[PDB]
Protein backbone atom coordinates (compact mmCIF):
# COMPACT_ATOMS: atom_id res chain seq x y z
CA UNK A 1 0.00 0.00 0.00
CA UNK A 2 0.84 3.73 0.05
CA UNK A 3 0.02 4.54 3.70
CA UNK A 4 2.37 2.33 5.68
CA UNK A 5 4.10 3.83 8.74
CA UNK A 6 7.24 2.19 10.20
CA UNK A 7 9.17 2.92 13.39
CA UNK A 8 12.93 2.49 13.50
CA UNK A 9 14.56 0.54 16.35
CA UNK A 10 18.21 -0.23 17.04
CA UNK A 11 19.26 -3.20 19.15
CA UNK A 12 22.53 -4.87 20.01
CA UNK A 13 22.19 -8.63 20.03
CA UNK A 14 24.51 -11.08 21.79
CA UNK A 15 25.04 -14.73 20.97
CA UNK A 16 23.98 -17.44 23.43
CA UNK A 17 24.84 -21.17 23.48
CA UNK A 18 22.37 -23.29 21.47
CA UNK A 19 20.63 -20.25 20.01
CA UNK A 20 23.29 -18.17 18.33
CA UNK A 21 21.52 -14.82 17.93
CA UNK A 22 18.21 -16.70 18.17
CA UNK A 23 16.63 -15.32 14.99
CA UNK A 24 15.74 -16.41 11.49
CA UNK A 25 16.18 -14.23 8.47
CA UNK A 26 14.36 -14.43 5.18
CA UNK A 27 14.14 -12.21 2.10
CA UNK A 28 16.79 -10.64 -0.11
CA UNK A 29 16.90 -9.53 -3.74
CA UNK A 30 17.32 -13.16 -4.83
CA UNK A 31 14.77 -14.46 -2.32
CA UNK A 32 11.69 -12.24 -2.53
CA UNK A 33 8.50 -12.64 -0.44
CA UNK A 34 6.27 -14.92 -2.52
CA UNK A 35 3.15 -12.87 -3.16
CA UNK A 36 4.29 -9.25 -2.81
CA UNK A 37 7.75 -9.59 -4.36
CA UNK A 38 9.26 -7.60 -1.44
CA UNK A 39 13.06 -8.03 -1.34
CA UNK A 40 13.69 -6.72 2.18
CA UNK A 41 15.62 -8.82 4.63
CA UNK A 42 13.04 -9.76 7.29
CA UNK A 43 13.21 -11.31 10.75
CA UNK A 44 10.93 -14.28 10.09
CA UNK A 45 11.26 -15.95 13.51
CA UNK A 46 12.51 -15.09 17.01
CA UNK A 47 13.30 -18.08 19.20
CA UNK A 48 11.50 -18.33 22.55
CA UNK A 49 13.93 -18.21 25.47
CA UNK A 50 16.60 -16.92 23.07
CA UNK A 51 18.70 -13.76 23.32
CA UNK A 52 16.63 -11.75 20.76
CA UNK A 53 13.28 -12.26 22.47
CA UNK A 54 11.88 -8.86 23.54
CA UNK A 55 14.43 -7.11 21.30
CA UNK A 56 13.40 -8.07 17.74
CA UNK A 57 9.95 -9.14 16.53
CA UNK A 58 8.73 -11.37 13.72
CA UNK A 59 8.19 -9.27 10.56
CA UNK A 60 10.77 -6.60 11.47
CA UNK A 61 12.43 -5.36 8.29
CA UNK A 62 16.22 -5.29 8.66
CA UNK A 63 17.77 -2.06 7.54
CA UNK A 64 21.40 -2.34 8.69
CA UNK A 65 23.72 -4.88 10.35
CA UNK A 66 26.88 -3.44 11.93
CA UNK A 67 26.61 -0.30 9.78
CA UNK A 68 26.14 -2.23 6.51
CA UNK A 69 22.92 -1.67 4.51
CA UNK A 70 20.57 -4.59 3.94
CA UNK A 71 18.56 -2.75 1.26
CA UNK A 72 18.65 -4.72 -2.03
CA UNK A 73 21.18 -7.39 -0.99
CA UNK A 74 21.52 -11.12 -1.66
CA UNK A 75 20.19 -13.34 1.14
CA UNK A 76 23.70 -14.87 1.53
CA UNK A 77 25.18 -11.39 2.00
CA UNK A 78 22.84 -10.72 4.93
CA UNK A 79 23.67 -14.11 6.43
CA UNK A 80 27.41 -13.39 6.02
CA UNK A 81 27.11 -10.07 7.89
CA UNK A 82 25.71 -11.86 10.90
CA UNK A 83 28.12 -14.86 10.56
CA UNK A 84 31.14 -12.50 10.79
CA UNK A 85 29.81 -10.65 13.82
CA UNK A 86 31.58 -11.47 17.05
CA UNK A 87 29.84 -11.62 20.40
CA UNK A 88 27.67 -8.61 19.45
CA UNK A 89 25.64 -7.50 16.43
CA UNK A 90 24.19 -3.99 16.12
CA UNK A 91 21.00 -4.28 14.07
CA UNK A 92 18.70 -1.48 12.87
CA UNK A 93 15.17 -2.52 11.98
CA UNK A 94 11.88 -0.95 10.87
CA UNK A 95 8.66 -2.17 12.57
CA UNK A 96 5.11 -1.55 11.36
CA UNK A 97 3.40 0.98 13.59
CA UNK A 98 0.67 0.03 15.95
CA UNK A 99 -0.97 -3.35 15.66
CA UNK A 100 -3.49 -5.19 17.79
CA UNK A 101 -6.93 -4.62 19.30
CA UNK A 102 -8.43 -3.23 22.51
CA UNK A 103 -9.93 -6.64 23.46
CA UNK A 104 -8.74 -10.23 23.06
CA UNK A 105 -10.46 -13.28 24.53
CA UNK A 106 -8.88 -16.74 25.04
CA UNK A 107 -11.21 -19.69 24.95
CA UNK B 1 -5.37 -2.88 -0.45
CA UNK B 2 -7.42 -3.88 -3.51
CA UNK B 3 -5.56 -7.05 -4.55
CA UNK B 4 -5.90 -9.35 -1.56
CA UNK B 5 -6.66 -13.04 -2.20
CA UNK B 6 -8.09 -15.24 0.59
CA UNK B 7 -8.67 -19.00 0.73
CA UNK B 8 -11.62 -20.40 2.66
CA UNK B 9 -11.10 -23.28 5.13
CA UNK B 10 -13.60 -25.12 7.31
CA UNK B 11 -12.52 -26.92 10.48
CA UNK B 12 -14.29 -28.62 13.34
CA UNK B 13 -12.62 -27.85 16.64
CA UNK B 14 -12.94 -29.90 19.83
CA UNK B 15 -12.37 -28.71 23.37
CA UNK B 16 -9.49 -30.10 25.44
CA UNK B 17 -8.82 -29.82 29.20
CA UNK B 18 -6.79 -26.71 30.12
CA UNK B 19 -7.05 -25.26 26.62
CA UNK B 20 -10.71 -25.06 25.78
CA UNK B 21 -10.64 -24.62 22.00
CA UNK B 22 -7.07 -23.30 22.38
CA UNK B 23 -7.55 -20.05 20.45
CA UNK B 24 -7.83 -16.34 21.05
CA UNK B 25 -10.23 -14.11 19.20
CA UNK B 26 -9.97 -10.41 18.62
CA UNK B 27 -11.85 -7.90 16.47
CA UNK B 28 -15.54 -7.13 16.10
CA UNK B 29 -17.52 -4.04 15.09
CA UNK B 30 -16.98 -2.56 18.57
CA UNK B 31 -13.34 -3.70 18.74
CA UNK B 32 -11.67 -2.76 15.46
CA UNK B 33 -8.01 -3.42 14.55
CA UNK B 34 -6.15 -0.31 15.71
CA UNK B 35 -4.55 1.07 12.56
CA UNK B 36 -6.70 -0.30 9.72
CA UNK B 37 -10.10 -0.09 11.43
CA UNK B 38 -10.91 -3.66 10.25
CA UNK B 39 -13.89 -5.08 12.19
CA UNK B 40 -13.46 -8.76 11.27
CA UNK B 41 -13.31 -11.34 14.00
CA UNK B 42 -9.72 -12.66 13.83
CA UNK B 43 -7.90 -15.61 15.35
CA UNK B 44 -5.16 -13.66 17.13
CA UNK B 45 -3.43 -16.61 18.82
CA UNK B 46 -3.37 -20.42 18.57
CA UNK B 47 -2.04 -22.19 21.66
CA UNK B 48 0.92 -24.55 21.18
CA UNK B 49 0.03 -28.13 22.08
CA UNK B 50 -3.66 -27.14 21.96
CA UNK B 51 -6.47 -28.69 19.94
CA UNK B 52 -6.52 -25.94 17.23
CA UNK B 53 -2.83 -26.18 16.36
CA UNK B 54 -2.48 -27.24 12.69
CA UNK B 55 -6.16 -26.42 12.11
CA UNK B 56 -6.40 -22.63 12.53
CA UNK B 57 -3.61 -20.07 12.10
CA UNK B 58 -2.92 -16.67 13.61
CA UNK B 59 -4.52 -13.94 11.44
CA UNK B 60 -7.29 -16.18 10.06
CA UNK B 61 -10.43 -14.10 9.57
CA UNK B 62 -13.47 -15.85 11.05
CA UNK B 63 -16.41 -15.95 8.72
CA UNK B 64 -18.88 -18.30 10.46
CA UNK B 65 -19.21 -20.22 13.75
CA UNK B 66 -21.74 -23.08 13.73
CA UNK B 67 -23.54 -21.55 10.73
CA UNK B 68 -23.76 -18.06 12.27
CA UNK B 69 -22.09 -15.15 10.44
CA UNK B 70 -19.29 -13.25 12.14
CA UNK B 71 -19.37 -10.38 9.62
CA UNK B 72 -20.05 -7.07 11.42
CA UNK B 73 -20.77 -8.50 14.90
CA UNK B 74 -19.95 -7.37 18.44
CA UNK B 75 -16.89 -9.05 19.96
CA UNK B 76 -19.11 -10.43 22.78
CA UNK B 77 -21.43 -12.01 20.20
CA UNK B 78 -18.53 -13.95 18.67
CA UNK B 79 -17.36 -15.03 22.12
CA UNK B 80 -20.93 -16.15 22.98
CA UNK B 81 -21.13 -18.33 19.84
CA UNK B 82 -18.08 -20.25 20.93
CA UNK B 83 -19.13 -20.31 24.65
CA UNK B 84 -22.43 -22.03 23.72
CA UNK B 85 -20.77 -24.64 21.52
CA UNK B 86 -20.64 -28.09 23.01
CA UNK B 87 -17.76 -30.50 22.48
CA UNK B 88 -17.44 -29.35 18.84
CA UNK B 89 -17.38 -26.04 16.97
CA UNK B 90 -17.59 -25.82 13.18
CA UNK B 91 -15.64 -22.72 12.12
CA UNK B 92 -15.24 -21.27 8.62
CA UNK B 93 -12.26 -18.98 8.13
CA UNK B 94 -10.54 -17.02 5.35
CA UNK B 95 -6.71 -17.18 5.17
CA UNK B 96 -4.46 -14.88 3.15
CA UNK B 97 -3.05 -16.72 0.16
CA UNK B 98 0.54 -17.71 -0.06
CA UNK B 99 3.04 -16.26 2.37
CA UNK B 100 6.69 -16.96 3.04
CA UNK B 101 9.97 -17.18 1.14
CA UNK B 102 12.02 -19.79 -0.71
CA UNK B 103 14.91 -19.51 1.80
CA UNK B 104 15.07 -18.97 5.56
CA UNK B 105 18.23 -19.15 7.65
CA UNK B 106 18.38 -19.60 11.47
CA UNK B 107 21.39 -18.15 13.21
Swiss-Prot record, chains A, B:
Tissues where the protein occurs: The alpha-containing isoform is found in most epithelial cell junctions. The short isoform is found both in endothelial cells and the highly specialized epithelial junctions of renal glomeruli and Sertoli cells of the seminiferous tubules.
Disulfide bridges in this chain: none
Post-translational modification: Phosphorylated at tyrosine redidues in response to epidermal growth factor (EGF). This response is dependent on an intact actin microfilament system. Dephosphorylated by PTPRJ.
Subcellular location: Cell membrane; Cell junction, Tight junction; Cell junction; Cell junction, Gap junction
Domain of life where this protein originates: Eukaryota
Segments forming domain PDZ: 10-97
Composition bias type Basic residues, residue spans: 89-97
Role description: TJP1, TJP2, and TJP3 are closely related scaffolding proteins that link tight junction (TJ) transmembrane proteins such as claudins, junctional adhesion molecules, and occludin to the actin cytoskeleton. Forms a multistranded TJP1/ZO1 condensate which elongates to form a tight junction belt, the belt is anchored at the apical cell membrane via interaction with PATJ. The tight junction acts to limit movement of substances through the paracellular space and as a boundary between the compositionally distinct apical and basolateral plasma membrane domains of epithelial and endothelial cells.
The record's note on its domains: The 244-aa domain between residues 633 and 876 is the primary occludin (OCLN)-binding site and is required for stable association with the tight junction.
Family of the protein in this entry: Belongs to the MAGUK family.
Subunit structure: Homodimer. Forms heterodimers TJP3. Forms a heterodimer (via PDZ2 domain) with TJP2/ZO2 (via PDZ2 domain). Interacts with OCLN, CALM, claudins, CGN/cingulin, CXADR, GJA12, GJD3 and UBN1. Interacts (via ZU5 domain) with CDC42BPB and MYZAP. Interacts (via PDZ domain) with GJA1. Interacts (via PDZ domains) with ANKRD2. Interacts with POPDC1 (via the C-terminus cytoplasmic tail). Interacts with HSPA4 and KIRREL1. Interacts with DLL1. Interacts with USP53 (via the C-terminal region). Interacts (via ABR region) with F-actin.
Protein name from the UniProt record: Tight junction protein 1
Section covered of the full-length record: 18 to 110 of 1748
Amino acid sequence: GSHMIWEQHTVTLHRAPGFGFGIAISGGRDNPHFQSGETSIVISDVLKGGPAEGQLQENDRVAMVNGVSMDNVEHAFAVQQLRKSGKNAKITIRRKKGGGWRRTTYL
